[PDB]
């Protein structure tokens, strides 16, 4: 089940920014659910929504950037405005929303695993990360780089945490053909193999040797493979045997 507010408190403040997902329009405006501050409905009247064909769009799926005007902190009533939000911090707001979404996505494995309420899990996550640091995505990033935030809280599920870490955390192939004619052979082959290994190396049938080289930062691959090939070439020519590289 999907519930629970993004921040620490249930109800929004004055002047703060929220992102809304629209469900239905006309008659009132948009009494719609929020994706920045809880799943409970918040309404805009048909005046603050538009500035500059207006009725033609705004149905299901489309997102609106809005500022909160009036909050009733007693039973549950939210008032919003679209016109006031200037296009200077809109990008920043969008970024924030994205970060929030990512955080929410991150808090799903736990929900899946131990079959317990999501809100409590969220609360348990938000106490070290969302409280002291500020925004949560950056904190998460920091943790993944250098463990610094997970120290403050004890884990009821360490395995789940490990899984999460794992989730948060390129193979190139080469061909070598061997066909000797000299005295010794198997030993030579072994030697050749030893010059082209360092991760995963496997044998297929007989004439071909297949090795997979792991790339650190995308472009890397030729800077070792070629050397290995050269070494192989150096190896086999001395005794009286021939090897080919396509």
């Amino acid at each position: 089940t999907s519930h629970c507010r993004f921040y620490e408190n249930k109800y929004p403040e004055i002047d703060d920014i929220v992102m809304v997902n629209v469900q239905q329009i006309a008659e009132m405006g948009a009494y719609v659910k929020l994706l920045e501050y809880d799943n409970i409905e918040g309404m805009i009247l048909l005046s603050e929504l538009s500035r500059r064909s207006i009725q033609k769009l705004i149905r299901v799926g489309k997102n609106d950037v809005a500022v909160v005007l009036r909050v009733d902190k007693e039973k549950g009533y939210i008032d919003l405005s679209k016109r006031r939000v200037s296009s200077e911090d809109i990008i920043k707001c969008e970024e924030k929303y994205q970060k929030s979404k990512t955080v929410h996505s991150i808090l799903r494995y736990c929900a899946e695993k131990f079959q317990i309420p999501l809100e409590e899990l969220y609360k348990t996550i938000a106490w070290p990360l969302s409280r002291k640091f500020g925004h949560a995505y950056e904190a998460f990033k920091l943790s993944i780089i250098d463990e610094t935030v997970w120290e403050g809280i004890e884990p009821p599920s360490k395995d789940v945490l490990d899984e999460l870490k794992n989730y948060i955390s390129v193979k190139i192939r080469a061909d070598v053909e061997v066909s000797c004619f000299s005295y010794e052979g198997i030993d030579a082959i072994k030697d050749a193999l030893k010059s082209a290994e360092d991760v995963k190396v496997k044998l297929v049938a007989a004439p071909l040797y297949v090795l997979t080289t792991q790339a650190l930062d995308k472009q890397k691959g030729i800077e070792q493979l070629e050397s290995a090939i050269e070494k192989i070439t150096e190896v086999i020519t001395k005794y009286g045997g021939v090897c080919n590289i396509t």
Binding site: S53, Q55, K56, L57, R59
Partner: protein
């Protein structure tokens, strides 16, 4: 462009407001012509399914495809020969078969868009956004309009209804389907159809495929099911700023009958169907195909038979002419529902200022 004229059949003494015939069989085609358009033309030449609404959508799709295919050249700019190309395409379309008001509107919109974006902008960045905008437009001025129509129907139509329609009005078919399956109510739907087009038949088939009880009808009588019939929607193509309708076949007759007996008729349309051009008779602008739909003795369309029919010039003077589009009246279609929800056709151009 290629080859024009060189065709049989006389000019006809009765009714000659528009030119009557063309490019069907391809020979010596130009290098720059996109084959999709040709294919579409070939389809339209002998088409059964589409009418007004889906045609425009298809055209839009084709245009989008063309846009996707095209990049800014080194010598010529982005706004250098595009307009010319568009014009050529339009001419070709005209040559093939006369077009709709919606299509014209779309063309106008495209032109406006072209005018808007300056050639100094990055090219890759430009069409990335342009295509998105086009998509948005498509979503709004078609699918959203359809949705609006559906919702209008929902509030208005009573608890389960007997419905009568004509033609291949795709939106109306969709609505019917929705009524049948989605919201779930009784659908005693009656469809009428003429000789030259098997549109009604096709619609009936489609309904059957979805699981709908259909009543099939022809020209000889309509009243046989009326004298019982309670609520009726008519076939739509294009609207004028008079309050009249330019639609397909004996819809006018049906409307007249409705006026005579018990209850008037109502038509729902898209908000971008309206024109600002006006006319008031079935002599103004006639839409024509070849007199061959009734030459084959009933049943199916591709048959090839030996018999008696086929005397366009063979015997001592004979003409076998017909019409496709006729004038629907004003006093009878009281209802018009669009992107602006509610209104009457008496308010013939109340939405043209707002748009």
């Amino acid at each position: 462009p290629g080859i024009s004229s060189v065709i049989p059949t006389v000019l006809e003494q009765s009714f000659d407001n528009s030119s009557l015939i063309s490019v069907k069989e391809l020979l010596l085609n130009k290098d720059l012509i996109h084959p999709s358009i040709l294919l579409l033309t070939s389809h339209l030449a002998h088409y059964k399914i589409v009418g007004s609404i889906p045609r425009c959508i298809a055209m839009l799709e084709v245009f989008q495809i063309v846009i996707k295919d095209y990049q800014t050249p080194k010598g010529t700019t982005l706004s250098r020969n595009l307009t010319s190309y568009l014009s050529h395409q339009i001419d070709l379309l005209k040559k093939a078969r006369p077009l709709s008001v919606t299509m014209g509107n779309a063309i106008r919109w495209l032109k406006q868009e072209i005018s808007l974006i300056d050639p100094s902008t990055p090219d890759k960045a430009a069409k990335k956004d342009l295509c998105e905008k086009i998509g948005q437009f498509a979503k709004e001025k078609i699918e959203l309009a359809d949705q609006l129509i559906i919702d209008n129907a929902s509030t208005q139509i009573e608890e389960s209804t007997t419905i009568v329609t004509y033609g291949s009005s795709k939106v109306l078919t969709e609505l019917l389907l929705h009524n049948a399956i989605s919201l779930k109510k009784n659908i005693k739907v009656i469809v009428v159809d003429s000789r030259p087009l098997f549109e009604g038949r096709k619609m009936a088939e489609t309904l059957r495929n979805a699981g709908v009880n259909v009543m099939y009808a022809l020209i000889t009588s309509l009243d046989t099911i009326f004298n019982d019939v309670d609520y009726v929607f008519l076939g739509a193509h294009s609207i004028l700023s008079n309050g009249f309708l330019y639609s397909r076949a004996g819809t006018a007759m049906l409307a007249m009958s409705a006026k005579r007996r018990n209850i008037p008729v109502l038509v729902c349309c898209e908000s971008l169907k309206f024109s600002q051009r006006v006319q008031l008779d079935s002599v103004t602008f006639n839409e024509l195909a070849d007199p061959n739909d009734l030459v084959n003795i009933d049943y199916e369309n591709p048959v090839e038979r030996r018999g008696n029919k086929g005397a366009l010039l063979n015997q001592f003077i004979k003409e076998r002419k017909f019409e496709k589009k006729k004038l629907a009246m004003e006093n009878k279609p009281k209802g018009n529902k669009i992107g602006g929800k509610k209104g009457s056709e008496g308010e013939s151009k109340d939405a043209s200022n707002e748009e």
